[PDB]
Structure formats: structure tokens, C-alpha cells
Structure 1
Amino acid sequence: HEWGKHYCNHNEDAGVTCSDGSDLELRLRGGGSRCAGTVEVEIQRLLGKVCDRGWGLKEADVVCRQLGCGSALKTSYQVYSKIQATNTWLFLSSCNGNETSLWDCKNWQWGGLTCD
């Protein structure tokens, strides 16, 4: 539309992350086994978490589908605890559930906001 004459702010600036696809890792940590726990993301040597903004079972099926586990049932744990803490987050809007990898879901954002 125009240069500068907008009402955005510096807490909602843009950015980009690019990769060839050989270093995108997704996993679960802090649970009974590999197929349960909190979702842990790894990209280009930095590891962070995700944010509940629509984390329904239908959207959650994709994470299980990528790792070879079955479907998604609930959002909790029973066995193990005390996972590491990182101040970086990933945001996902919506996914229809039949895409085999989380990296293919529409408009997945890596970092830039804190979901308080």
C-alpha cells in the first residue's frame, strides 16, 4: 500500500528461516517413551517448544504421524518429568490433518512472539 504510513509495531515485525530440509527434527520429551511427552522442536541447532493455539486431536495427529507412532489420544503424561526449559516458541494456526509432516502445515511460524 505505502511506505511507513501504517500502525504496526516493532513487536510484530517479519523475518524468515530457510533450510534445505536435512536438519528439521521434531520429537517428544519428558514422558514414558519416545511416543509421548511435550513436543520439542529442533532446527539449525536451536531447540524449542510449541504453543497451544488450537492443539486439538485432529491437528495433533500429524506429530504422531511423522514419528511413526499411531494417532493422537490425549495431551498429558504419567511417567517421567524434569525437562529442559527454553525461551523460544513456535506457532501453528491450523492444519487439516492429512499432511504427513509438521513442516508442511500452512503458515507455521518459528519465533517472534510470546504467547503469555
Structure 2
Amino acid sequence: GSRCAGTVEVEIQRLLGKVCDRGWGLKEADVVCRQLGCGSALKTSYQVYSKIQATNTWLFLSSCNGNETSLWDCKNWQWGGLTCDHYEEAKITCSAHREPRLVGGDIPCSGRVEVKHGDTWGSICDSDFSLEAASVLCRELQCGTVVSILGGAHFGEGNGQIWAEEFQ
């Protein structure tokens, strides 16, 4: 769904391909997230939004440090020549899949909730945001524990688009 969550698809010389997860930890995962520009890597898995096709060729990552600015820049990455049948495809969910922010509030950790769906910042309907979701939002922004959930545009109506996802 979002640009920074899902399987790692690779285009090399107009050839579609997907990364095999052998030798694929979180160190290589955050290199991809940094390459796409979405912070660090959260998990080598994603919540599926749409089906994708299957490609015969695979990208194999032997090992690389994890501080590289791009996946191609880290040493000895193999493109094709092996089958990822014994292993699985390499998935990733970067930190900007749903990055929250609080706007419109006159105090540091209060305001209208806005969540970035990869690159676009959009509001949230108060029927799609539970107390657990607000707790996760406050924890992620290092704002501690949630005090209240104020619906009906308490901090003013946002300008843009409203997301249609209920956070479970």
C-alpha cells in the first residue's frame, strides 16, 4: 500500500526482481529504508495490501555493514544466478509506513493527529483511532502516555486528505 512497506522489488536493467531473505537481517533492511528515505527498519514483514506477481530472478545479499546510503553500495550483492526456493522473499516495513505527528496544539505533545502514508500527510477520522492506537502514537513520538482522545477537530480541521484506515 505505502511506498515504504512491502516486499523489496528490484529493477536492474529493466528486469523485475525481488530480494531473497537469505542473509537478510534488519541491518540490510534499514539500508533499503534509508535508500528509499523512510528512516530505519521496523520489521522484515508487512501487512499485505495488494497482490504482486512472482519473478524468477532474485537479488541475494551476502552481507554488508548497514550504514550504507544505498543497497547497491554495500559489498558483494548477487543479482540472479540462484533460486530462492529454500528461503523466502525479503519483506520490510520502514518507520515511515505510518509516521504520526501532532499539529495545531499550543503544547508539545497535543494536537490534531496526522499520519504520513509514506509521503503524504493526512488527518484521521476519530472513529478510526482507538485508545490503543493513541497510546502507540504517544509512545512513538516519545510523548509518554495518552491523556485524552479529542475528536470532532478539537485542534482545528486539517487541510488535505483523510485516511480511511481503522487502527487495530
User: TM-score, normalising length from structure 2?
Assistant: 0.48
* 2:42 aligned counterpart, secondary structure: coil
Q: How many residues align?
A: 85
What is the aligned partner in structure 1 of residue 103 from structure 2?
Answer: none
Structure 1's unaligned 5+ residue stretches are 1-31
Distance 2:24 2:50 in 1: 21
Partner of 1:64: 33
Q: Which has the larger radius of gyration?
A: 2
Q: Which residue of 2 is the match for residue 80 of structure 1?
A: 49
Deviation at 1:79, TM superposition (A): 4.6
Letter in 2 for 1:103: W
Give the whole-Å Cα distance in 2 for the aligned partners of 1:59 and 1:42.
Answer: 17
Q: Name the structure 1 match of 2:144.
A: none
User: What displacement does 1:115 show?
Assistant: 2.6
Once the two structures are superposed, residues 2-45 of structure 1 have per-residue CA deviations (whole angstroms, 9 ceiling, x without a partner) of xxxxxxxxxxxxxxxxxxxxxxxxxxxxxx30000000000111
Alignment match of 1:96 (pick from 41, 65, 76):
65
Secondary structure, aligned partner of 1:64: helix
Contact 2:25 2:44 in 1 (8 A): no
2:9 aligns to what? 40
Task: Considering fraction of residues, name the structure with more strand.
Answer: 2
Give, as a single letter, the amino acid of the residue that structure 2 aligns with 1:62. V
Query: What value does the CA root-mean-square deviation take over the aligned residues?
Result: 1.1
Report runs of 4+ in structure 1 exceeding 2 Å deviation. none
Instruction: Describe the superposition over 1:56-103 as per-residue Cα deviations: whole angstroms up to 9, x where unpaired.
Output: 112211000011101001122225121111111111111111110111
Q: Secondary structure at the match of 1:61?
A: helix
What letter corresponds to residue 24 of structure 2 in structure 1?
W
Secondary structure in 1 matching 2:41: coil
Given the two structures, how large is their TM-score scaled by the length of structure 1? 0.69
Listed as ranges, the gaps of 5+ residues in structure 2 are 86-168
> What fraction of aligned residue pairs are identical, expressed as a percent?
100
> Secondary structure of 1:91's match?
strand
